[PDB]
Each structure stands twice: as C-alpha cells, then as structure tokens.
Design a binder for this molecule. Structure first.
Ligand SMILES: *[C@@H]1O[C@H](CO[C@@H]2O[C@@H](C)[C@@H](O)[C@@H](O)[C@@H]2O)[C@@H](O[C@@H]2O[C@H](CO)[C@@H](O[C@@H]3O[C@H](CO)[C@@H](O)[C@H](O)[C@@H]3O)[C@H](O)[C@H]2NC(C)=O)[C@H](O)[C@H]1NC(C)=O
Ligand SMILES: *[C@@H]1O[C@H](CO)[C@@H](O[C@@H]2O[C@H](CO)[C@@H](O[C@@H]3O[C@H](CO)[C@@H](O)[C@H](O)[C@@H]3O)[C@H](O)[C@H]2NC(C)=O)[C@H](O)[C@H]1NC(C)=O
Ligand SMILES: *[C@@H]1O[C@H](CO[C@@H]2O[C@@H](C)[C@@H](O)[C@@H](O)[C@@H]2O)[C@@H](O[C@@H]2O[C@H](CO)[C@@H](O)[C@H](O)[C@H]2NC(C)=O)[C@H](O)[C@H]1NC(C)=O
Ligand SMILES: *[C@@H]1O[C@H](CO)[C@@H](O[C@@H]2O[C@H](CO)[C@@H](O)[C@H](O)[C@H]2NC(C)=O)[C@H](O)[C@H]1NC(C)=O
Ligand SMILES: *[C@@H]1O[C@H](CO)[C@@H](O[C@@H]2O[C@H](CO)[C@@H](O)[C@H](O)[C@H]2NC(C)=O)[C@H](O)[C@H]1NC(C)=O
Ligand SMILES: *[C@@H]1O[C@H](CO)[C@@H](O[C@@H]2O[C@H](CO)[C@@H](O)[C@H](O)[C@H]2NC(C)=O)[C@H](O)[C@H]1NC(C)=O
Ligand SMILES: *[C@@H]1O[C@H](CO)[C@@H](O)[C@H](O)[C@H]1NC(C)=O
Ligand SMILES: *[C@@H]1O[C@H](CO)[C@@H](O)[C@H](O)[C@H]1NC(C)=O
Ligand SMILES: *[C@@H]1O[C@H](CO)[C@@H](O)[C@H](O)[C@H]1NC(C)=O
Length: 644
C-alpha cells in the first residue's frame, strides 16, 4: 500500500500540462491516507483494487505506469483523458482484472496480445483511440468476457476466429474500424450474444450461414461494409432479432423468405445493395415491422399483397428498384404509416384507395413510375401531407377537384403528368408550402390571385402548361421566391412591374409566352438574380437601361422578340454576364465600344438584327459561329464572318 501509493505518485509526477485544481491533488500523505482520501483509489485489506481516474484531465503515457507495484488491480478505468503512447504488454499482468477501460484517449499502436492473459476479464473497453493492427487472437481466451468494445479505432485484419470461443460474450462492438477479410463462421458459436455491431468496416465475403445459430442476438448491425454473396436464409432463424441492418454492402441474390419468421423484427435495413428477384410474400408476416427500407436495390416483380398484414408499419422505403405491376392496397393500409417512398420504379395502374386512409401519411414519393388514373379520394383529403411527389407519371383529372387543403404541406411536385383544370385557390391554405412545381401538365385558366399571397413560397414552377391571362401587379407579394418559372404558357399582356419587388429572385423564366409591349423600365432591383429568360415573347421597343443594374446577372436571354434600337453601352455594368442571347429581334446600330470591358462573355448570339459596324473585343465574338453573328445589316469593319 505505501509502496503502491509511492509507485502511483512517481507515475503521477510524469503527467504533463497539469493544474493545481486537478482532482489528483488528494494524492498526498502516502503513508496514512492512500486508501481513505485519494481520489479514484479504493482498497481491500489495504491494497488498491480499483483505480478510477476517468475524466480527470490527465495528460501522460503508460510507459512509467507501476505495473509490478499494483498486483491486486481488479478495476481500471482511465477513460476520457489525454493519455498518449501505446498499451504496454504489462497490462496483461493484472491477473485479477475484471474491468479494463482505456477508452476516449489518444492511444496508438497495436493491442498487446498479452491481454489474453487476463483470465478474469469481463469487460474490455478501448474505444475512440487510434489503435491499429490486427485484433490479437489470444483475446478469444478470455472466456468470462461479457462485452468487448473496440469501436472507433484504426484496427485492420480479420476478426479472430478465436472470438467464437467467448461463450459468455453478450455485446461485440467493433464498428468504425478497417477490419477486413471474411466474417469468421465461428461467430455463430456465440450462443450468449445479444448485440453484434460490425458496421462501418471493410469486411468482405459472405455472411456466415452459421449466424442462424445466434438465437439471442437482438441487434445485428453490419451495414457499410463490402460483404458479397446473398443473404443466407439462416438469418431467418435469429429469432430474437429486432434490428437487422445490412445496408450499403455489395450483397446479391434474392431476399430470403425466411425473414418472415423474424416475429420481433421492427427495423430492417437492406438498402444500397444489389439484391435482385421478387420480394417474398412471407415478408408480410414480419408482424413487428416498423421501419422497412429495402430501397436502392434491383428488386423486380410486384410488391406482395401480404404487406397489408404489417399493421405496425410506419416507414416503407422501396424507392430506386425495378418493382412493377400495380400497387396493392395493403402497402398503405397501416394505420400508422407516415412515410411511403415508391419513386423510381416501374409501377403501373392506378393508386389504391388506401393511400392515406388513416389520415397520417406525411411523405409520399411516386416519381418516375408508369402510374395513371385519378388521385384517390383519401389522398385528396390527406391533411397530414408534408411532401408529395407525383413527377413523371400519367396521373389525370381535374387538378381543382383532385387536391384538397393541405395545411402541413411543405413540398409538392406534380410535374410531367396529364392533370387538367384550373389551379384552385385552395393551395393558399398550404401556408407552409415552400415549393410548388407543376411543370408539363394540361393546366388551363388563370393563376388565382391567392397564389401571390403565399409569401413563404420559395420556388414556383408552373412552366409548360396552357395557363392564360395577364399577371397582376400583386405578384410583388412573393417576397421569398427565388426560382420563378412561368415559361411555356400563354400568359399575355405586359410583364408586371411588381417583379421589381421579388428581391430574393435568383432564377426568373418568363419565356415562350405572349407577353407584349415594353420590358418594364423600372425592373432594376433584383440583386440576387443571375438568370433571366424573357425569350420567345411579343416584347418590343428598346432594351431598358434598368436591366443593366442587375449586376449578378450571369445569363440573359431576350431572344425571339421585337426589341428595337441600339444595344446600350451600359451593358458593361454586367461584369458577371457570361451568356447573352439577343437573336431574332430588330436591334440596330453598333455593338457599343465598351464590350471589351466585359470579360466573362463567352456565349453570345446577336444574329438576325439590324445592327451594323464592327464586332467588339472579347472572346465570344472571336469564338462565334456563322449562325451566332449572321443576318445583321453591316457586319464587321472588313465584312467578315470568319476572323477579323
Ligand atoms: C500503427 O501506428 C503506429 C503509430 O503511428 C502514429 O500514429 C498514427 C495514429 C498516425 O498518426 C501515424 O502517422 C503515426 O506515425 C505506426 O508506427 C509508427 O511508424 C512511424 C513511421 O512508419 C514512426 O515514425 C518514425 O519515427 C522515427 C523517430 O523515432 C523516424 O526516424 C522515422 O523517420 C519515422 O518518422 C513512428 O515512430 C511509429 N510509432 C510507433 C512505432 O509507435 C505503425 O507503423 C502502425 N502500424 C500499422 C499501420 O500497421
Ligand atoms: C430560354 O427559354 C427558351 C424556351 O422558352 C429556350 O429555348 C430553347 O433553346 C434550345 C437551344 O437554344 C432549343 O433546343 C434546340 O431545339 C431544336 C429543335 O429540336 C434543335 O434543332 C436545336 O439543335 C436545339 O436542340 C429549344 O428547342 C428551345 N426551346 C423552345 C421551347 O423553343 C432557351 O434556350 C432559354 N434560354 C437559355 C439561356 O436557357
Ligand atoms: C425594324 O425597325 C425599323 C426601325 O424603325 C424604328 O422606328 C421607331 C419606331 C424606333 O423604334 C426607332 O428605334 C427605329 O428607327 C423599322 O423601320 C421603320 O418602319 C416604319 C414603318 O412603321 C417607317 O415609318 C420608318 O421610316 C422606318 N425606319 C427606318 C429607319 O427604316 C422597321 O419597320 C422594323 N421592322 C419590323 C419588322 O418591325
Ligand atoms: C495484494 O497482493 C499481495 C501480493 O501480490 C497479496 O499478498 C499475498 O497474500 C497471500 C495470501 O493472503 C500470501 O500467502 C502471500 O504471502 C502474500 N504475498 C505478499 C508478497 O505479501 C495480498 O493478499 C493482495 N491483497 C488483495 C486484497 O488482493
Ligand atoms: C468510475 O467512476 C464513474 C463515475 O464516478 C462510474 O460511472 C458510472 O458507471 C455506472 C455503470 O458502471 C453508471 O450506471 C453510472 O451512471 C456512472 N456514473 C457516472 C457519474 O458516470 C464508473 O462506473 C466507475 N468505474 C469503476 C470501475 O469504478
Ligand atoms: C460495392 O458497391 C459500391 C456502391 O457504392 C461500389 O462503389 C462504387 O464503385 C463504382 C466504381 O467501381 C462507382 O459507382 C463509385 O465510384 C463507387 N461508389 C459509389 C457508387 O458510391 C463498389 O465498387 C462495389 N464493390 C464491388 C462491386 O466489389
Ligand atoms: C501542453 O499544452 C500545450 C498547449 O496545447 C502543447 O503545445 C504542449 O505540447 C502540451 N504538452 C507539453 C508537454 O507541453
Ligand atoms: C477455440 O477453443 C478450442 C478449445 O480446444 C481450440 O481447440 C480452438 O483452436 C479455439 N479456436 C481458435 C480459433 O483458437
Ligand atoms: C440463448 O438462447 C438459449 C435458447 O434456449 C437460451 O436457453 C439461453 O438462456 C440464451 N442465453 C442468453 C445469455 O440469453
């Protein structure tokens, strides 16, 4: 004891960057108080058996640790400190060691195989260090081990097959490492195992079929590895499983139907693999299933109708597969289903009547399927909707009757469908809606004025429709819109001056419309705008000087219009302007002597105008093709279509 206290004092004297306020100040009077007052020290029969210095700001190494002087250590917790260096082999000399924790330190080097001498060890914790090399196989000797935690290290090599000899192990945590090679099938001998976390490693090979003997494992995390082969059907024999995660691997073959035998399985993650074949209908017998994610695979065939038996199903992710056939009604029949991601598949037919039958669906994705028909009535009245994506289908019906009031709606995408009718003002009650995208539909009529009352709208895309009417000046109320796309419609009249007020506007496209008369002269107050496309309209008169004050403009397209007069010399204020399309207009005069000042100008078309004179000094005019510069009255000082 006095020798133990002296030995620990000499080790303490090697600590660096220490403070008088350290909790080790109590290490005084070794001859009297070692077993009564010393912080972290506890004794039996006046001999230290417990050294607990966790989170005491100790900075040092174990080189001068008094191994020989503390023979009776049974509990060592030196975690959450600033210990550096290696783990000396003499740590294996503490024959009575039961608990050993060096976690959350700055230790380096390999794990000494002498730890396999600690025959009484029940907990080994070495997490969150920089330990490298292979795990010693002699650790498999420690048959009293209840828990091994080596995660968040730099360990390499295979998991030792001796680990199968640890008949009392309950938890094996080896995640966040660089372990490699095949998983030893001897792990199937770990009959007491409850948690197997080998995720985030570089493990290869097949999942051992002996895993079917692990009847007590409730958590199997092996995701983010490089496992190959197919999921062995023996996995369906791990009856205690409630979480099975094999995602982000290179697994192939079919999903074994034996997974339906996992009556306690609540979480199944199989995504980001190369699984093929059909989804077994026996997967509908996973009665506890809450979170089923087998998205991002190559599964084919139809979704089984037995999915209606998954009464606890909350999240279903089937996106990015090759599933086909009609969507069976049981896929959305769960009363607690809140996420239903089916996009990027080959589903056909119409949506089932069960989609939002409980009024709890929040996330629905159906992008890029072959679906068609009407929106089901339970979807029209699904007030819990937060995101809904129908893009890339053949859905039909009156858009004013197919969609109700969605107060919790945040994002909706109806693009590339066959919706008809007029935009209803009901959308205005989606006070949380930040994006409304309905490109490429058969929407007709005017835009209801309530749409401009959506100050929270960030992105509004009604392009490639048959919308008509004149835009009112109340369009200025969209304070937070940054992407406005109304192009490809039959909107008529003047462009409203109120677009001035859309300060956050970055991307504005009013092209391919019937806008007439002059571009608003006041339109000069869009500091975030980098793209403006007013092409293919009926606009005329001079190009207004206000456009030259939108400094951040990168791309400007005023082509296919009836603008006249001269290109202003104030285009020099568009230093950021890269693309400038002015073709098919009635512009006149000289390209202003000032275009040299503009530098980022690479793609310019000024063809089919009445301009005359010489081309100015910058790339795009040198790099212009015949079509880019043709059709003007008097081109170039030396009448050139080729260089100078
Ligand atoms: C396991 O890791 C050790 C230690 O590596 C050290 O810590 C890591 C977390 C990384 O930050 C490494 O960059 C860092 O070095 C490896 O051993 C170490 O090898 C290096 C060079 O390979 C040794 O540096 C040498 O130091 C001498 C001076 O004594 C110089 O003359 C040399 O030119 C060279 O700079 C370093 O001393 C050594 N550290 C030890 C042995 O504790 C080890 O190779 C690695 N094992 C693996 C990856 O299998
Ligand atoms: C501004 O919006 C208009 C449309 O509103 C864009 O016009 C599009 O321009 C591209 C190329 O300039 C056209 O593609 C061309 O199609 C023809 C016919 O298929 C083909 O022969 C060409 O080789 C080229 O592929 C496209 O058809 C045209 N769209 C329409 C509806 O006319 C314009 O590009 C936009 N401006 C900017 C800067 O993006
Ligand atoms: C293309 O433009 C020319 C230029 O005329 C414009 O006239 C003003 C209205 C103003 O815009 C100026 O910047 C231009 O000079 C048109 O030519 C004129 O045509 C009118 C007939 O309406 C005639 O009275 C004028 O004398 C013409 N002027 C010149 C200089 O020739 C031309 O008609 C326009 N072409 C098209 C297809 O629109
Ligand atoms: C602490 O360690 C010492 C030695 O490692 C133990 O002392 C031995 O005790 C046994 C039986 O009690 C004796 O037969 C030996 O002669 C002792 N050896 C020495 C060098 O004293 C001591 O029992 C241990 N104490 C605890 C609480 O584990
Ligand atoms: C060392 O001391 C710490 C804190 O004084 C102990 O941490 C406790 O550990 C148990 C589990 O063994 C937890 O249930 C407690 O909540 C923890 N408390 C705190 C404050 O962290 C730790 O167990 C001790 N270790 C040894 C070997 O004595
Ligand atoms: C396992 O699957 C992953 C998929 O993430 C593969 O990683 C990709 O490999 C190719 C290049 O060979 C590219 O698609 C990407 O560069 C990789 N990363 C991705 C897609 O995130 C990996 O190659 C596969 N291993 C195999 C087949 O042995
Ligand atoms: C002590 O802390 C300083 C500041 O972080 C650091 O530069 C130094 O390496 C540490 N160790 C010693 C022995 O000074
Ligand atoms: C596991 O223990 C048995 C006991 O005899 C031994 O024969 C076997 O070699 C051990 N496995 C490994 C991989 O060391
Ligand atoms: C492992 O499962 C078997 C199955 O019979 C059971 O008897 C045993 O108690 C379980 N072990 C643990 C540690 O739960």
């Amino acid at each position: 004891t006095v020798s133990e206290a002296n030995a620990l004092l000499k080790w303490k004297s090697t600590f660096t960057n220490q403070t008088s306020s350290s909790k080790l100040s109590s290490w005084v009077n070794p001859n009297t108080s070692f077993c009564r007052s010393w912080y972290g020290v506890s004794c039996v029969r006046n001999s230290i058996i417990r050294l607990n210095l966790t989170n005491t700001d100790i900075e040092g190494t174990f080189q001068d640790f008094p191994f020989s002087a503390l023979p009776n250590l049974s509990y060592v917790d030196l975690s959450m400190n600033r210990f550096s260096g290696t783990i000396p082999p003499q740590f294996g000399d503490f024959s009575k060691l039961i608990y050993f924790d060096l976690s959350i330190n700055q230790l380096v080097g390999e794990i000494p195989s002498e730890l396999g001498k600690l025959s009484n060890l029940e907990t080994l914790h070495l997490v969150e260090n920089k330990l490298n090399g292979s795990i010693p196989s002699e650790i498999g000797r420690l048959t009293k081990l209840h828990e091994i935690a080596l995660y968040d290290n730099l360990l390499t090599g295979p998991i030792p097959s001796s680990f199968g000899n640890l008949t009392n192990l309950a938890n094996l945590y080896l995640f966040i490492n660089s372990l490699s090679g095949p998983i030893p099938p001897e792990l199937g001998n770990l009959s007491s195992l409850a948690e197997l976390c080998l995720d985030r490693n570089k493990l290869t090979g097949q999942i051992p079929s002996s895993f079917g003997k692990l009847k007590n494992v409730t958590l199997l995390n092996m995701f983010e590895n490089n496992l190959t082969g197919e999921i062995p059907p023996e996995i369906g024999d791990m009856s205690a499983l409630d979480t099975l995660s094999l995602h982000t691997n290179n697994l192939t073959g079919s999903i074994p139907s034996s997974l339906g035998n996992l009556k306690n399985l609540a979480i199944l993650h199989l995504y980001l693999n190369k699984l093929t074949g059909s989804i077994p209908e026996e997967l509908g017998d996973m009665e506890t299933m809450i979170d089923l994610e087998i998205s991002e695979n190559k599964l084919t065939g139809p979704v089984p109708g037995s999915f209606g038996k998954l009464t606890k199903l909350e999240w279903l992710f089937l996106r990015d597969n090759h599933l086909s056939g009609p969507i069976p009604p049981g896929i959305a029949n769960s009363s607690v289903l809140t996420v239903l991601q089916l996009d990027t598949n080959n589903f056909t037919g119409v949506l089932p009547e069960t989609i939002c039958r409980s009024g709890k669906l929040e996330d629905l994705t159906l992008d890029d399927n072959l679906l068609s028909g009407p929106i089901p009535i339970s979807l029209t009245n699904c007030k819990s909707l937060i995101r809904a994506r129908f893009k890339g289908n053949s859905f039909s019906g009156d858009i004013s009757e197919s969609f109700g009031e969605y107060p919790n709606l945040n994002f909706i995408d109806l693009s590339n469908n066959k919706f008809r009718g007029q935009i209803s003002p009901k959308w205005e009650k989606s006070r949380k809606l930040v994006a409304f995208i309905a490109t490429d539909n058969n929407i007709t009529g005017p835009i209801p004025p309530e749409i401009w009352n959506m100050t929270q709208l960030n992105q509004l895309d009604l392009s490639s429709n048959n919308i008509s009417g004149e835009l009112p000046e109340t369009i200025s109320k969209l304070t937070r819109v940054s992407k406005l796309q109304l192009n490809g419609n039959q909107l008529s009249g003047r462009i409203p001056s109120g677009i001035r007020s859309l300060a956050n506007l970055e991307y504005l496209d009013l092209s391919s419309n019937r806008f007439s008369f002059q571009i608003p002269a006041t339109l000069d107050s869009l500091p975030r705008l980098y793209y403006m496309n007013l092409s293919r309209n009926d606009l005329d008169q001079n190009i207004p000087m206000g456009l030259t004050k939108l400094s951040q403009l990168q791309t400007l397209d005023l082509s296919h219009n009836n603008l006249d007069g001269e290109i202003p010399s104030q285009f020099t204020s568009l230093q950021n302007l890269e693309k400038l399309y002015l073709q098919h207009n009635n512009l006149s005069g000289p390209i202003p002597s000032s275009f040299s000042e503009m530098k980022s100008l690479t793609h310019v078309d000024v063809s089919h105008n009445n301009l005359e004179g010489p081309i100015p000094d910058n790339a795009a005019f040198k790099n212009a093709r015949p079509d880019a510069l043709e059709g003007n009255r008097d081109l170039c000082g030396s009448n050139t279509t080729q260089g100078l």
